[PDB]
Amino acid sequence: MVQKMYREFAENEVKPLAKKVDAEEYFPKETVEKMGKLGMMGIYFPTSVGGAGGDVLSYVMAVEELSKVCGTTGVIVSAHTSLCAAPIYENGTPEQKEKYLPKLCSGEWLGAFGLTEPGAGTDAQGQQTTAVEDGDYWVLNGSKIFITNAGYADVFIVIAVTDKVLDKKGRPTKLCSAFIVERTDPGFSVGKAEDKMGIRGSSTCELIFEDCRIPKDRMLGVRGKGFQLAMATLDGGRIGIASQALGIAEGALQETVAYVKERKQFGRSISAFQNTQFELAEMKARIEAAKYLVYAAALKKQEAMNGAKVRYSVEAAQAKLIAARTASDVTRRCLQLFGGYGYTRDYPIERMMRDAKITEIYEGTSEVQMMVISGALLK
Amino acid sequence: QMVQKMYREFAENEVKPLAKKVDAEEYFPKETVEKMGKLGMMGIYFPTSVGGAGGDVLSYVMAVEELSKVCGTTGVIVSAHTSLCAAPIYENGTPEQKEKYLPKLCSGEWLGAFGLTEPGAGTDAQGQQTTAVEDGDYWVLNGSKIFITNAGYADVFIVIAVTDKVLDKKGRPTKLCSAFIVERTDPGFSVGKAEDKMGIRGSSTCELIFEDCRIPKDRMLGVRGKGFQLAMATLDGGRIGIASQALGIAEGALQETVAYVKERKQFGRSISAFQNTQFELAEMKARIEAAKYLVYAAALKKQEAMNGAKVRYSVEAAQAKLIAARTASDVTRRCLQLFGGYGYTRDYPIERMMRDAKITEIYEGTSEVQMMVISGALLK
Amino acid sequence: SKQQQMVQKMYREFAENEVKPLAKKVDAEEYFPKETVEKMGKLGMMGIYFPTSVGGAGGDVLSYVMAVEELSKVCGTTGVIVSAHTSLCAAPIYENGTPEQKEKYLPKLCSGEWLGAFGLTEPGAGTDAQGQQTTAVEDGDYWVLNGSKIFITNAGYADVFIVIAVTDKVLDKKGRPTKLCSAFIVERTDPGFSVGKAEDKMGIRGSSTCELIFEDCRIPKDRMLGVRGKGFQLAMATLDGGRIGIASQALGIAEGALQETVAYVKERKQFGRSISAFQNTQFELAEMKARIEAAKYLVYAAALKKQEAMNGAKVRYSVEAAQAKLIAARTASDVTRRCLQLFGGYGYTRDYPIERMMRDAKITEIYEGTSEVQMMVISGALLK
Amino acid sequence: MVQKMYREFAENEVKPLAKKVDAEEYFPKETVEKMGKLGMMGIYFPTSVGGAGGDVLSYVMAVEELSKVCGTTGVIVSAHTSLCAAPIYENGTPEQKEKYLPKLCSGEWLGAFGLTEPGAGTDAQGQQTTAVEDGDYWVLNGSKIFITNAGYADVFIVIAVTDKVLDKKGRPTKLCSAFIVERTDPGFSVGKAEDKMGIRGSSTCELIFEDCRIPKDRMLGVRGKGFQLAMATLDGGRIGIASQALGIAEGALQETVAYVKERKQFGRSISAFQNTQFELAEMKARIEAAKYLVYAAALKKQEAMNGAKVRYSVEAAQAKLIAARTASDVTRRCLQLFGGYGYTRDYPIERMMRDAKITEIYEGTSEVQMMVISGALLK
Ligand SMILES: Cc1cc2nc3c(=O)[nH]c(=O)nc-3n(C[C@H](O)[C@H](O)[C@H](O)COP(=O)(O)OP(=O)(O)OC[C@H]3O[C@@H](n4cnc5c(N)ncnc54)[C@H](O)[C@@H]3O)c2cc1C
Ligand SMILES: Cc1cc2nc3c(=O)[nH]c(=O)nc-3n(C[C@H](O)[C@H](O)[C@H](O)COP(=O)(O)OP(=O)(O)OC[C@H]3O[C@@H](n4cnc5c(N)ncnc54)[C@H](O)[C@@H]3O)c2cc1C
Ligand SMILES: Cc1cc2nc3c(=O)[nH]c(=O)nc-3n(C[C@H](O)[C@H](O)[C@H](O)COP(=O)(O)OP(=O)(O)OC[C@H]3O[C@@H](n4cnc5c(N)ncnc54)[C@H](O)[C@@H]3O)c2cc1C
Ligand SMILES: Cc1cc2nc3c(=O)[nH]c(=O)nc-3n(C[C@H](O)[C@H](O)[C@H](O)COP(=O)(O)OP(=O)(O)OC[C@H]3O[C@@H](n4cnc5c(N)ncnc54)[C@H](O)[C@@H]3O)c2cc1C
């Protein structure tokens, strides 16, 4: 009753704004605040922490419905929910939960997450942002690159190097910890918005820590287990991105069906040619196959959230790998069915193709997803 | 999930040892068909009230999938018998027809088969010319069916024949078909020689010849003139079974490949240690899971329709049949590569799984047909 | 290979020195590179395979194909600016023009002072090139053109246009009314002719693609190019040459993307090593280069068939072009997407050119005949 | 002329034996008898060693036309020519040339080549068959596996380990040497024919060396340079296999175009549907692109053998990679167009798909070809 339900909720919230968001690199604060007033920034979190008391699948559906019409809007929510609000709720203390989750789930605060560094993006373990103890404070130094929501975010999750310890075989190893960084923390700046191929309305900025001293109780999770917390967070985030890729491919298919039904070239609708029919049919099935992967991932996560001791990293990895590749594949072929008109800004299909490309890259590339799947498989 | 591990144990202990002989000798596995019947597996999702085992459609799907992991021949025998012969009788039969055929069919004493395809028109399933004529209290059948699964070993057949000669309101001449239950002991009915196929070679794929086949009046299944509608509703359920067959062939191919690359060594390391091997297996695994969810989703939409929920599952079946068949052919080809030269010989079963995977793209409606069904609903 | 390897270098140096430093500004600013076209004109690169007798540079068709390839390795916009100008405006004039029409337009087209363009596509039917409605009517000593063309490359900066208009309304063998077309040389200065709204496009954004408007466009009688009623056959013989140019543009985009990728993966590190030390990166590059090399041979072969036809050997090259256009365009889109993948997040930003190349590669599958058109050409010949 | 005419020769040889050669695992010895008398066993070899005096391209065309009808016949010629006769000519002394090349190019002697071992197939540098000096003789011991033509071959090229030396810095390494082995050499045995998925008429057997005492002069090439001789031999053979794959795909496309013109389902030919036309058109374009790669490599090796000093390993690697992947893809999509009739032995398409599978593996798998190509590219 929450799953079937919210799908219409999210379907009615629609996209008269997607063209200007993309064309003008414009962050949609109107949509974000409407979402806060609607509970869409706190969906699967319990009401005891400020959330809307929904389930993980309803969150996935919301992202997918938004991403059908604006990939940028889907990633703003997804990143804020899965990458900032989720690790607080999943590893934070009652005090940490109460101080941060009510304002994140209501929309009052926007959340971001910084792991990626210039030389340690895929090698997220070999990073160089550091954190040292100073009495009752921590002192951070370094930078984070390509951080979603960063220009408009109020709270940031930051992974920094806290200890340099030894491994079993004497090789020095770096241990990280997660830190809750507020936008007002001194010595913390947000750089300029990057110029991207797509999801342009999304604020992708650099983080700069120049002696950012934060209170001692901003440490999230177990000291030195920050890498494990980061990888656990990305597992939930990868379900979010997979649901984004799914909506882009679904939105692209939606528009293409409408277009081929009305345009006629040889005296008949373009939909009357067999090639058009087979392309749309094969694409739809591929999209359906990806939809169930995404849906299966979301509820395996729900199982883990409900106390069951199950792992969902593999399911999430499979979902993001297949959804992202399906999204790029569907958008390219759908643009083909538009002909020359699909190469212009009159229609959204060109934006959707640019937007689809990112889902294969960010929050862990497809290659990293295959490392996850094969690791479980070959073990 | 409890029935699934039963099937897995049965398929590995009782079916897998026989797959090589079944394929290499074009050997119908009469033995295991008797064993499965004793285990109630030829009637899985039919209720106990008609002689079934009282399972659900998915347990049947999981059984076909699990059998097909080790023997594509065994999987299709169960699938065709269940979805193409037993299902149409349960869906459109009279209480007399159900009580006579369903208990023996679900028990396994009688094997089932479906005749639709003819030589002149196989994809054009509405341009066929096998006929049934009124004669007193009997029907007279005449024609031929081609490529019939289980034909050489089936006791009861579902036969689609042209009965009425009508012409549509548009103006074009239209053939109306009817479905008929034909028993192997019928006069003027014979089964041809087994075809020589590329894969699923133990499956008995033969001709059906009707030369003045005289059958009773009460052998007509369903409404007169709707026989083609009966065939297309039967095929929708069958395509779910073929989808789970393709899924199982891909699943078993990957399983053997993962095993092989861990133990076989090259350049000093296991082949599993090379990044290209890991990514091929990873990508194939994700594609197989995507197909699996499609298959189970279709199986449950059909379960809804069987429980009273008036939904259609044609498109869900069409999607599952389409994706799972192309995944099977893709996976087995790439899995064979990871075997190297050893995968080209009969020592391993990868070459049989590749040959078995191709048929899933074709029979019970080609992938092109599946795209016709899907786009017809989408573009409506 | 030949001293054609000497001219191949010219296009590579020129692309790397004069064109490559401008590609980002061309794309980001939707900026027609008016400075490079003038440079290429002074270099005779807008007349490459036309003879000196008609004031070209006296090269071969293969040289022009490589010129487009080398330019499209760095800037797809610059590549298509030459390709349409050469293969879609100057080629039909040279192929079907009277000595006056040749002497008048070719000296300016091959020099660079005049830029060319081709109008076929209309809104109501672009793929269905037999159902258009731009009309041309006899009026005394002049022709009167009315209608519109859409998507025309170079339209906002071109001086002379090849326009296909419906002249003859004739009855066919089956009794249906068929429309016959004629080709006309329209100068930017003709009364009643206007280039119109440009297009904000996905890629090749520096290219000037605008609509053409004919509102009582009155042009001389001797502007007609070719025979009356056979303008459509002229347009399809023009497109056969142009599809070789776009196949080379696609080939170049795929080639330049691979060069950039191989450079990036050798210098960028992770997990202790260079990204080129991982097997997946190696097999991705190796397979793309093998596909690209196969597309090159198709493109190059279509060029030689075209040059065989020009040298008097009566041979058809429409299938060879369609094969080139189909495979090269699908290779470009595939290579650029997979190359961007190997860049990680850095490929999604404007810092590097791979995202521009991926956006540019998508057009080669579409303009001057979609890939579905190409397959129609190829299957028609095969099933005949 | 030698190109445009030998195409006519090769297109003409017609035997209706392909079906039973593959169905009965029957080596077509009469076909080899006929081809030897036509001079098809030494085509590109000069007349002063006993060849026909043809070019490398005609050999490629002979394999391509034979493989268009019977992939088994194409591989017998290719293996015998490119893997046994070629290294005799290219590395043998005039004494070795005079003794072996006339009978090989005339078809009296069938050639074979052994490099692959049970544990060193892709890792052809880590094998264990050895050869030691004994008076005026060598002694060979070990085993080779998967050796084409071995069941009916008279002369064999055997790679054996002759020296274990130290490399530049100090690791022990194994050096190999080539050896000409005759069928009548004592202690040399041929095993049973393997049961293969396809090219089943070809004699794929194991070689066993139990005190294979051969005269001292049967050493081929420079001592300790056997492995270098191996890869250079496989370079030529890879062009041959590429031709086979090209032939298989071409013959596949041929039968399919014929079949779709004649078969009617919906009141019109299956050629009349758009899906069929696009499938055939795209495959034709794919095949044509492979054909150029095969020919280009063939003429690069013709340059080689005319004295010009260029390497054709990369060209041969690209040719085999693309052709093998095009053959498999084409045969599968052509079987689809046959419908249920293509799954039976009535038509040759299913045998074609089984034959296409082999070209991706032997004489260097696609992964080995990508190792070669990326080696040159990344260097
Ligand atoms: C950047 C750009 C520059 C251009 N420059 C020029 C120029 O300089 N000159 C010029 O003349 N044109 C130009 N064009 C137009 C271009 O050639 C057309 O866009 C192209 O021919 C496709 O036609 P269309 O855009 O009208 O789409 P449509 O014709 O509407 O095609 C829509 C889709 O339907 C498919 N389709 C159509 N008919 C069939 C059929 N019978 N069977 C199956 N599928 C079918 C098409 O392949 C396509 O996928 C340009 C276009 C672009 C985008
Ligand atoms: C092993 C095996 C077992 C079988 N078992 C059974 C059984 O138990 N019962 C039964 O009834 N049948 C059975 N068949 C027959 C099978 O169902 C038919 O063969 C199949 O439905 C179509 O095959 P065909 O050759 O008749 O179709 P064809 O139409 O001859 O197919 C030729 C090709 O044309 C394509 N095509 C056809 N029409 C169109 C169109 N309008 N648009 C585009 N493409 C089109 C098809 O997709 C196919 O690629 C079996 C076949 C095999 C091989
Ligand atoms: C739009 C956008 C939003 C982003 N948002 C965020 C955010 O909110 N939070 C955050 O922390 N980061 C974010 N990032 C950064 C992002 O996480 C990284 O870009 C991504 O994870 C990969 O980082 P990279 O590009 O440095 O990796 P690189 O390692 O530079 O990737 C280059 C290529 O090498 C491959 N590769 C690397 N190692 C191997 C290997 N061992 N084997 C095979 N292939 C390998 C990769 O898969 C890729 O194909 C964002 C990036 C973008 C573009
Ligand atoms: C019909 C047939 C005929 C043959 N005829 C001959 C003949 O005449 N002469 C001869 O010498 N040989 C012959 N062979 C052997 C053939 O050359 C080998 O089968 C082939 O080279 C692969 O070696 P393998 O079979 O040991 O596979 P393996 O090396 O056991 O397989 C390794 C697999 O892993 C893949 N892979 C991916 N990454 C790597 C990596 N980093 N390192 C290693 N592998 C990797 C490989 O591509 C391959 O798929 C024949 C084989 C067959 C099937």
CB burial string A262-279: b at 16+ within 10 A, e below = eebbeeebbbebbbbbbb
Same domain, A102 and A125: no
Q: How many domains does chain D have?
A: 3
End-to-end CA distance of chain D: 39
Mutate to test the pocket of ligand 1, among A266, A268, A270, A338 (most ligand atoms within 8 A of CB): A270
**Which amino acid type is present at position A340?**
G
Same domain, D59 and D138: no
**CA-CA distance, A223 to A207, in Å (whole number)?**
22
Ligand 1 centroid distance, CA of C222 (Å): 30
What backbone phi and psi angles, to 5 degrees, belong to B328?
A: -60, -50
**Best CA proximity match to C234, nearest among C46, C89, C381:** C89
Cα angle A343, A349, A354 (rounded to 5 degrees) comes to 85
CATH of the domain at C175: 2.40.110.10
- Neighbouring residues of B217: CB distance < 8 A, sequence distance ≥ 6: B137, B138, B139
**CA-CA distance, C351 to B30, in Å (whole number)?**
67
**Inter-residue contact B121 to D265 (CB < 8 Å):** yes
Phi-psi region of D26 (alpha: psi -120 to 50; beta: other; left: phi over 0): beta
How many CA atoms within 13 Å lie on the side-chain side of A345? 13
**Best CA proximity match to B243, nearest among B137, B328, B158, B150:** B328
Q: Is any Cβ of chain D less than 8 angstroms from the Cβ of B167?
A: no
- Neighbouring residues of B24: CB distance < 8 A, sequence distance ≥ 6: B201, B346
Same domain, A95 and A119: no
Strand intervals (E) in chain D: 111-114, 130-134, 137-148, 155-166, 172-182, 188-190, 204-215, 219-220
Same domain, D198 and D248: no
Tokens of C365: 């599958």
Structural element, H or E, at residue C373: helix C371-382
- Neighbouring residues of B68: CB distance < 8 A, sequence distance ≥ 6: B74, B75, B76, B244, B245, B246, B247, B248, B249, B252
Strand intervals (E) in C129-265: 135-139, 142-153, 160-171, 177-187, 193-198, 209-220, 224-225
Tokens of D117: 């071992």
Tokens of B25: 């000798």
Same domain, D174 and D92: no
What backbone phi and psi angles, to 5 degrees, belong to A45?
A: -95, 145
**CA-CA distance, A134 to A129, in Å (whole number)?**
16
Residues in chain C: 384
Place of tokens 């969150």: A59
Residue D152 pairs in a beta bridge with: none
Same domain, C243 and C357: yes
C-alpha distance from residue C279 to each of A170, B274, C274, D30 (Å): 28, 7, 11, 46
Domain boundary among B80, B111, B142: B111
**CA-CA distance, D354 to D359, in Å (whole number)?**
10
Tokens of D87: 């290294």
Ligand 1 centroid distance, CA of C88 (Å): 16
- Neighbouring residues of C200: CB distance < 8 A, sequence distance ≥ 6: A344, A345, C30
**CA-CA distance, A312 to B289, in Å (whole number)?**
14
**Inter-residue contact C264 to C26 (CB < 8 Å):** no
Chain A CA closest to residue B270: A378
Q: Is any Cβ of chain A less than 8 angstroms from the Cβ of C132?
A: no
Same domain, B242 and B274: yes
**CA-CA distance, C322 to C236, in Å (whole number)?**
12
Which burial class, exposed, middle or buried, applies to B336 when counting CB atoms under 10 A from its CB (0-12, 13-18, 19+)?
A: buried
Residue C230 pairs in a beta bridge with: C181
How many CA atoms within 13 Å lie on the side-chain side of A281? 30
How many CA atoms within 13 Å lie on the side-chain side of A175? 12
Q: In this structure, what is the dihedral angle of CA atoms C12, C14, C16, C21, given to the nearest 10 degrees?
A: -160
Query: 3-state class of C184 per DSSP?
Result: strand
Place of tokens 């540019």: C360
Tokens of B41: 């597996």
Same domain, B139 and B212: yes
Which ligand places an atom closest to the C-alpha of B260?
4
Phi-psi region of A196 (alpha: psi -120 to 50; beta: other; left: phi over 0): beta
**CA-CA distance, B154 to C334, in Å (whole number)?**
50
Chain A CA closest to residue C345: A361
**Best CA proximity match to C118, nearest among C26, C224, C239:** C239
**Inter-residue contact D105 to D85 (CB < 8 Å):** yes
Q: Is any Cβ of chain B less than 8 angstroms from the Cβ of C271?
A: no
Beta carbons of C367 and A123 less than 8 Å apart: no
Identify the DSSP state of C88.
Answer: I
Neighbours of B25 (CB within 10 A): 10
Query: 3-state class of B19 per DSSP?
Result: helix
- Neighbouring residues of D30: CB distance < 8 A, sequence distance ≥ 6: none
**Best CA proximity match to D72, nearest among D297, D354, D366, D369:** D354
Cα D191 to chain centroid, rounded: 20
Place of tokens 């370094």: A142
Beta carbons of B297 and A292 less than 8 Å apart: yes
CB burial string B1-13: b at 16+ within 10 A, e below = eebeeebbebbee
Q: Is D105 in the pocket of ligand 2 (CB under 6 A)?
A: no
- Neighbouring residues of B373: CB distance < 8 A, sequence distance ≥ 6: B314, B315, B318, B365
Query: 3-state class of C141 per DSSP?
Result: coil
Same domain, A257 and A342: yes
- Neighbouring residues of B107: CB distance < 8 A, sequence distance ≥ 6: B37, B40, B42, B43, B51
User: What is the structure's resolution, reported in angstroms to one decimal?
Assistant: 2.3
**Best CA proximity match to C158, nearest among C124, C191, C185, C180:** C185
With DSSP H G I counted as helix, E B as strand and the rest as coil, what are the percentages for chain A, rounded to 5? Answer: 55, 15, 30
Query: 3-state class of D92 per DSSP?
Result: coil
With DSSP H G I counted as helix, E B as strand and the rest as coil, what are the percentages for chain B, rounded to 5? Answer: 55, 20, 25
Q: Is A269 in the pocket of ligand 1 (CB under 6 A)?
A: no
Ligand 2 centroid distance, CA of B322 (Å): 14
Which burial class, exposed, middle or buried, applies to B96 when counting CB atoms under 10 A from its CB (0-12, 13-18, 19+)?
A: exposed
Beta carbons of D369 and C295 less than 8 Å apart: no
Residue ranges of alpha helices (H) inside B131-274 are 227-263
Domain boundary among B225, B248, B283: B225
Identify the DSSP state of C345.
Answer: G
Same domain, B247 and B305: yes
Q: Is D204 in the pocket of ligand 4 (CB under 6 A)?
A: yes
Place of tokens 């985009």: C253
Tokens of C158: 């071109």
- Neighbouring residues of B1: CB distance < 8 A, sequence distance ≥ 6: none
Place of tokens 């310890």: A165
CATH of the domain at D44: 1.10.540.10
Show the domain range for C23.
Answer: 4-115
Tokens of C91: 């080629």
- Give B2→chain C minimum CA distance, Å: 40
B322 contact residues in A (CB cutoff 8 A):
281-282, 285
Same domain, A233 and A363: yes
**Which is the catalytic residue, given C113, C215, C368, C372?**
C368
Which ligand places an atom closest to the C-alpha of C345?
3
Domain boundary among C54, C81, C115: C115
What's the longest Cα–Cα distance across chain C? Answer: 79
What's the longest Cα–Cα distance across chain D? Answer: 80
**Best CA proximity match to A315, nearest among A301, A305, A336:** A301
The full DSSP string for B233-299 is HHHHHHHHHHHHHHHHHHHHHHHHHHHHHHH-EETTEEGGGSHHHHHHHHHHHHHHHHHHHHHHHHH
Strand intervals (E) in D115-154: 130-134, 137-148
A288, A289, A370 ranked by CB distance to B283: nearest: A370
**CA-CA distance, B76 to A185, in Å (whole number)?**
66
C-alpha distance from residue A325 to each of A99, C333, D135 (Å): 39, 14, 65
Identify the DSSP state of D379.
Answer: -
Tokens of A316: 């999430």
Tokens of A298: 């979301």
**Inter-residue contact C92 to C242 (CB < 8 Å):** no
Same domain, B244 and B371: yes
Strand intervals (E) in chain C: 116-119, 135-139, 142-153, 160-171, 177-187, 193-198, 209-220, 224-225, 269-270, 273-274
Mutate to test the pocket of ligand 2, among B363, B367, B370 (most ligand atoms within 8 A of CB): B363
Mutate to test the interface with C, among A343, A361, A363, A370 (most CBs of C within 10 A): A343
**Best CA proximity match to C163, nearest among C112, C224, C242, C97:** C224
C-alpha distance from residue C353 to each of A173, C245, C255, C373 (Å): 36, 22, 13, 30
Mutate to test the interface with B, among A330, A374, A379 (most CBs of B within 10 A): A374
Residues in chain D: 379
**CA-CA distance, C64 to C48, in Å (whole number)?**
6
**CA-CA distance, C274 to C266, in Å (whole number)?**
6
Residue D161 pairs in a beta bridge with: D130, D176
- Give B347→chain C minimum CA distance, Å: 29
CATH of the domain at A353: 1.20.140.10
